[PDB]
Amino acid sequence: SLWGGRFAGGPSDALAALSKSTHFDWVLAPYDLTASRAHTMVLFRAGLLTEEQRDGLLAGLDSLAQDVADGSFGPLVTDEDVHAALERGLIDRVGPDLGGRLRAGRSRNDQVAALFRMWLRDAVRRVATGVLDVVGALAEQAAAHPSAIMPGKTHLQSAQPILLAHHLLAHAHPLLRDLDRIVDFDKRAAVSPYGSGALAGSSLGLDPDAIAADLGFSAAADNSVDATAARDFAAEAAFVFAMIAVDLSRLAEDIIVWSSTEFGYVTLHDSWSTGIMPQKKNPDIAELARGKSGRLIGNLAGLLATLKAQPLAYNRDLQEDKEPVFDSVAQLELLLPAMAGLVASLTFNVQRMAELAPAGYTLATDLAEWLVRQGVPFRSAHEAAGAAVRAAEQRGVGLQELTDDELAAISPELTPQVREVLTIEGSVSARDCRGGTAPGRVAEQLNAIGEAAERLRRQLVR
Amino acid sequence: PSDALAALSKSTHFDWVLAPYDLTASRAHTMVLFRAGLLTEEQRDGLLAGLDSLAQDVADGSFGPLVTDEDVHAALERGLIDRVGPDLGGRLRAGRSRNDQVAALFRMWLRDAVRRVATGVLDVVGALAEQAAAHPSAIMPGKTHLQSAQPILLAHHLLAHAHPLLRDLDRIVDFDKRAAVSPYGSGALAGSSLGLDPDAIAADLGFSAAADNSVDATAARDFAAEAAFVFAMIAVDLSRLAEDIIVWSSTEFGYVTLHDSWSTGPQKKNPDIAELARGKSGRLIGNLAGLLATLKAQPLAYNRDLQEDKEPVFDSVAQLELLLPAMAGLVASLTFNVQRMAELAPAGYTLATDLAEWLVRQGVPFRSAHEAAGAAVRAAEQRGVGLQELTDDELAAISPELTPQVREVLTIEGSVSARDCRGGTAPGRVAEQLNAIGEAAERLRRQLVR
Amino acid sequence: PSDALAALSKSTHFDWVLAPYDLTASRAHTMVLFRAGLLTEEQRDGLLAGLDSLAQDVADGSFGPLVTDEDVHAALERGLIDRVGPDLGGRLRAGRSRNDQVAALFRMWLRDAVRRVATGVLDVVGALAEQAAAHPSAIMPGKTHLQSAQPILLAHHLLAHAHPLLRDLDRIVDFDKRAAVSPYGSGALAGSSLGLDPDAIAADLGFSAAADNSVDATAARDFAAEAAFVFAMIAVDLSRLAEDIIVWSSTEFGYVTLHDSWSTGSSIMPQKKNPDIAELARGKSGRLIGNLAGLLATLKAQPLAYNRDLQEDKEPVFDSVAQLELLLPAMAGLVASLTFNVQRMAELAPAGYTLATDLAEWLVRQGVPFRSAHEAAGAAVRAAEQRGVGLQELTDDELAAISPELTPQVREVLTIEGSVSARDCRGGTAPGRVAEQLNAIGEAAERLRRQLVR
Amino acid sequence: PSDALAALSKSTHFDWVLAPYDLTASRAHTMVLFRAGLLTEEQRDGLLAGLDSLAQDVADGSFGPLVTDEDVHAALERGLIDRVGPDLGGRLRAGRSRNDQVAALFRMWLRDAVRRVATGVLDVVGALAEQAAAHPSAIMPGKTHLQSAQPILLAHHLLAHAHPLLRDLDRIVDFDKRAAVSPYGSGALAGSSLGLDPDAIAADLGFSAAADNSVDATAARDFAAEAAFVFAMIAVDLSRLAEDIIVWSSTEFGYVTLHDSWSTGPQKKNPDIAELARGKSGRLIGNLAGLLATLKAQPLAYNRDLQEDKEPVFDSVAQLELLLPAMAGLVASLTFNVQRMAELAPAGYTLATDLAEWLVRQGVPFRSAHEAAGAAVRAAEQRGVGLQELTDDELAAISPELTPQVREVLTIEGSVSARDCRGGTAPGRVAEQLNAIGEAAERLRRQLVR
């Protein structure tokens, strides 16, 4: 027998080898046992098992579950999958006779779909926990360094000075939206296929709504062919995982560049890096995060390509649904606490960041801006700024060092009050609308992040 | 600027589609400047006048991008100057930024675009629901592995293609909540130093909220990746429908006859539209894989790579805007050969399963239920009849529990009726299912409108 | 090292496959040191015997990674030091660098891997050729758009799946040429400062040449992306063959019967067969396209030189190979054991008056203008439908009534056998051509395995 | 044909680039018909002159597609008939077939396109070589993990981006041999029954050989996939160079200064070309992934899904045609800040490695060589000096093996000079490597021609 399908003789060596999934699907075991208990209650509530038969199966399953859990029951070298292994194990405990009675009204197709969903619902919550740990590490670094100012980058060129905290937090928001995506995903994942049978619906008079409720689902499927055939929930999980990986790679890239000798923004901790003197530390975790995001994009693209153009209903190609998702989850289970530890382990050189923030006359922008809100038109504000730069460049000073003689000599509009934005402190203070980098704003942002995170966590718990 | 740099950075051949939104953004900004007290009641009106002149000329086709123009914004500023002069039109340049503009404009576009895609998806759902409703009684082989398992209602099968599409609309609805956050007021990356109100501006421009972090608002493109994901998902779902139609339409199956206006071509008809749907779904997977690859490992904040956000998303939308009405029309146009499907539904003794499951229901242990069923096939093979054509004694000779009452499931009508739990193929369940699709579709439509 | 860092960087669960290659690189590095005069004859022989001992225990699986080993290389260093002491073992570390070693081992591994894949491909091609040779004269409908077009030889359809596979073998040959460049001697980035000879080392290790640039040699992975690509291409070609088989094996088509040992049947009907292998092929082609796309995404935008990201080059390529090593013999056995229902196929070949085309082509060949020829073919079809008859059963009086040009000579193409025989240019389905084609495939295959051997 | 079908099948907005090849095929076919004795000399020459005139009108823009033209082939049938009339026009339809012709045009177009890309690739390699030849002495930090490792010649780093591009050129050469097989004469699927010579036609059209199987020739698109891969591989190689340039030009590295004509812009210059290169490599990866997804699981022979082969490859080519001259120019325009690079090259006591390695060369066991270098660093860090400034006494204190001769590797120049095996950064090896790049590039160029 192979996947409950039958042979006059037996499968060829090469087919037996191709069919095997026990080296990755064993993590489905506990869910499979759960489903079996529920199917026992189904056959009972359908008057298909006596009280002792039901008790006989339930004790069989408990024993089996204990043995699976302690690692003393495993697959033989001949089981194609966890389902065949578990059937064999139950029959060992309860006899061909009683074990066989459980097989009645069972189909592999709705079973496999349901178990994958149950496992996914736990997996996205483990991933959610890792995401929250990274948001947490970012938010605690932001709270620990609420006044450091660094050059804000666009195209890796210095633009406006920003709070380091504001930059850190900018990495948390995509992570919060990924949690929001996990919440939205869970509602679609929470639909049970049990009762769908092979494709056409169960002919035992079972109740798909009750079984759903038994297993943690929020509802039962509306269409048995769809329930057994479709894998868009796996595709959606794969997308959310790739998205998380991509968001981590963006942070990973910052840390990598921040860590270079030339930037010197951060010093890596010895426990969270590898590796000329002790001054040479490699951001290996950040580099792995970068590389693994590629892999998770690949899992997603492969999964979609596997789903494409498949006719209804169940096909054996759908055996390929699990490994890419399992891989994505496993990588993120490794990556998320490594990245959270990395972020938390970081030491920032704020003197280095403060000396770079105003380089190449970036505050000229703040000058021009200041002038615009006096009432100077854009062209004149920007001519005056260019001039003040030229002046400071020829005099070899910073824009702030310019005397009032010179300020007035560039434009009568340039009151000495402009100096309040000609320092990095002052520049950053001016940016005080919602989302801006001013201290008052970033403090409220960090707070809103704590709330959204607790709100998202509570939405997942249900 | 070198010719090569200029050639590489021209975007007008795809971004012109953003022109209506830029004008709307320009109107809002005129208001921002006025409320900031940087425009007189008079200046404001001149600018608002000029933007309507530019708008009408844009919707006319009379104002167009010049080969000289780098992008849509350049063209429109030039076009504004040529309606209010360098003095006034230049006053608008005050307190504005490319980085937040571009993110905002794309989100506004996408929010219109997912609604057009939503409309097309609803068309395909209605087409499938209509064909299901028009075929209350047609029964077909239910396939796994392209092999006949249980008989199903054609309606049940068609509806199985409507449900993924409804989940896609549900995805669009969830996507729209994240898309509806405005970056306007973020400036280049650090936040505006005017005293504007991003909240007011968000409401003006049609968003539900303003962004919480100016760096994030200008650097992130995950809304674009999520859009690309939904489009790729819709296309993958259409490709499964496309594959069914292609196979059904083959000479050997003959389940459907294609309409001459919806095929090409003796009585040889090609399912061209379904073929294109299959092929295009790969292209949409590609757009998505490419876009995530583009976003990967970019440092903050804005980088010019993020300009590569627009084209794969534009392409996916444009493809679906063609594919959805064509698929909807292909589905509505099919003629199902109901007699052909009905004669195939019980072939290869598929009803042996229904016999085995009837026995299980009677109390018979699973292993002997199957032996009986296999034995029943054997008896019928020898005789060359079908299962229901077995005499009572023959039946009893296979098992005592095999009473004459088993015949209620040995026709395809009987088989299909026995599957009457939620989601099953029984006419009564399928009628409720069909009805619930309509209600689900109206609920999702109403959510997008709001 | 934190627990999270160590879990993240552990590769021994996949990289163990490089162990025998690492051992080979150690024997070669031993020689390098001896040739530079950094080892005595006795030390050299103690290291070589230490490595032989370790090769034995690796080969019998008695030596294995510890939970504590970062990767295969660390494990092998530990194992050697266990067998020759810290004293001697330490001497081998001299002049050693991880960056060039890792690139070299992966390339050595790939060169063996593509050769196992090529063998797998040659078996599928052999299974297709054997089936073609076994049915030299069976005719089937030719499909475009899953619609019956011109009749073709079954053999011509089967061989059509052999050609992309021969192109994939040709690509393995091209790939091998670029893969056979040794990075050994490039050090961490900048080149070795020992006086070692990279070209000597290359040859010890079975390479054809040594890298021209130390930074490129350590940092580049376009050789792994090319392998991944060739693997995806093979899987895509298999998937097209798989799709044919899936459709052919349906009830409605009934072109093939699946062999009992190569497909699952129904619980009740062991002989009502699902084409599981073909479906898994189709499904696995997605996975291999994803391996490729991911790997290229991994390589994208990496600054030079080496970065830890490049460690991610291995697993997608290992996965692709592993999948094909399972799939290729599955597919070969599946194709070799198919039963073709040649009678069903020949009854369907002239379905829907497909032979009307051959009639139109015949007229155009006599000088009849295109549009006239088709008007004539459509008339022959209507006459034939109206009279419940096949085109060839229209009498001379009826043919001549459609057109004076339609002489009884036209009947040479109103038979499927005659339709097939008229398509006799190179690449056509005529039996003479197909027989030559079948000969050339065998010679092309022999040519390609000779090329791999070198 | 319905509106939705018409809009979906319409290919003229991207297939127009195939017109010159379609006309070439039409000339070839006029000759086939002539050799089959279905054209008189005068009919042949009327068509050839018709085709020449149409070709000229196509080249100058005076003949274009109408909204009504399904595809390029239909637009050209229209235009031919306008020029030579319906009657001579219609003789050309005889014996021709869409499926073998579309595969042929695409191949012909690809083989020209890979040559244009190759020319772009040679330009970047040329720009890299020229910058390397212009810097025979500049030394920089060699990076791993973006951390300073061994000093390397700047030329050695620059040439490291040339080698992947030569391998891509080599991939193009290999690709071209497979692309160079003609499918013309395969008919729709089964072979032509016209008694034509496919080898003669192949020569006419510019191919090296004719297909061996009509079904494969008309169905298979692995040549498109292979081209897509080479293009994505070039884009990926460009993105690594782009990434280097983006990092080098940040204020913090200061390794290069950008040229005003090759960047956008206080005195802040953005490396836009480099950023666009990086973002477009994602797009090209996506084109490849999508195309392979389109090809996956397609039954033989021709299916309309295969029309989707073209746009991903056209896009890939178009993008590389803009990017390559822009990257070549960008590289040629850089100013390298050699003093900044030289000052960073020894930083963090990276020469400790060279010290240790020198000790190993002497005979010192690896672990001792290392503890010695660790000691030397400690000594110099306390004193605030470079390794080179440690006196003969303090060197002998650390180790008797550590004689004054060691100072030959404690300058960056000395460090770099010791790396003198093939492929190493020693000035004499790099000069040989540069010369070999010229030879390889010319050898490859020649393989591509004719």
Swiss-Prot record, chain C:
Catalytic activity annotation: 2-(N(omega)-L-arginino)succinate = fumarate + L-arginine
Pathway: Amino-acid biosynthesis; L-arginine biosynthesis; L-arginine from L-ornithine and carbamoyl phosphate: step 3/3
Source taxon at top rank: Bacteria
UniProt keyword annotations, A-Z: Amino-acid biosynthesis, Arginine biosynthesis, Cytoplasm, Lyase
GO-annotated cellular components: cytosol; peptidoglycan-based cell wall
Cell compartments where the protein resides: Cytoplasm
Entries under InterPro entries matching the protein: Arg_succ_lyase_C, Argininosuccinate_lyase, Fumarase/histidase_N, Fumarate_lyase_CS, Fumarate_lyase_fam, Fumarate_lyase_N, L-Aspartase-like
Family annotation (SUPFAM superfamilies): L-aspartase-like
Main localization of the protein described in the UniProt heading: cytoplasm
Record's keyword annotation contains Ion transport: no
GO molecular function, one term: argininosuccinate lyase activity
Keyword Amino-acid biosynthesis: yes
Coiled coil (UniProt feature): none
GO BP term (any one): arginine biosynthetic process via ornithine
EC number(s) stated in the UniProt entry for this protein: 4.3.2.1
Enzyme superclass (EC): lyase
Listed HAMAP family: Arg_succ_lyase (MF_00006)
NCBIfam families linked: argH
Membership in a protein family: Belongs to the lyase 1 family. Argininosuccinate lyase subfamily.
Protein name as it appears in the record: Argininosuccinate lyase
Upper taxonomic lineage: Bacteria, Bacillati, Actinomycetota, Actinomycetes, Mycobacteriales
